[PDB]
Amino acid sequence: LPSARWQYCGAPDGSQRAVLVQFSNGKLQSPGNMRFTLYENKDSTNPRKRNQRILAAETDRLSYVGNNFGTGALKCNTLCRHFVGILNKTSGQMEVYDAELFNMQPLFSD
Amino acid sequence: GGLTCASAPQGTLRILEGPQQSLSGSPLQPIPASPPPQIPPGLRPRFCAFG
Numbered sequence: 001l002p003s004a005r006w007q008y009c010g011a012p013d014g015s016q017r018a019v020l021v022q023f024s025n026g027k028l029q030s031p032g033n034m035r036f037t038l039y040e041n042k043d044s045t046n047p048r049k050r051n052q053r054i055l056a057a058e059t060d061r062l063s064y065v066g067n068n069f070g071t072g073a074l075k076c077n078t079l080c081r082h083f084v085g086i087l088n089k090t091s092g093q094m095e096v097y098d099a100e101l102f103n104m105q106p107l108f109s110d
Numbered sequence: 111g112g113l114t115c116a117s118a119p120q121g122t123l124r125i126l127e128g129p130q131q132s133l134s135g136s137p138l139q140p141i142p143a144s145p146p147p148q149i150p151p152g153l154r155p156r157f158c159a160f161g
Contacts (some may be wrong), residue, residue, distance in 0.1 A: 021115075031114075031115030035112050036114065037112060037113070087120075
């Protein structure tokens with residue numbers, strides 16, 4: 001059975017994280033026209049706030065927002081951990097990195 | 111300079127931590143079964159007739 005040699009190159013300080021997105025309303029038919037912007041909290045002194053992040057995705061018609069804090073932050077980001085594996089098919093080596101999962105949702109204000 | 115959607119993942123790995131089963135010995139009871147009530151040895155009659 002096909003197998004890969006596992007390596008956690010991972011994050012140098014653990015400060016580095018990749019970014020996974022999941023859309024609450026399904027799959028994006030055209031992810032190529034989306035612009036994602038990652039926002040971080042300016043407060044680096046508060047351990048609670050220093051890991052707060054917002055991911056915004058803008059389309060022509062709607063905006064999506066995901067956050068890793070508050071109601072929008074969901075349980076899967078903690079109870080479980082997410083990683084990204086980059087497999088080199090030639091070497092059979094899989095490099096594994098920490099990942100952060102954002103659940104994306106639509107933007108409207110009264 | 112922004113973030114763009116990349117190629118779809120080709121596979122998923124789900125990790126869980128699991129221990130294994132031991133041999134079946136099925137040691138039902140310390141002193142097992144319903145041990146039967148029984149005769150005290152010898153006993154002897156504790157009663158006699160008159161005469």
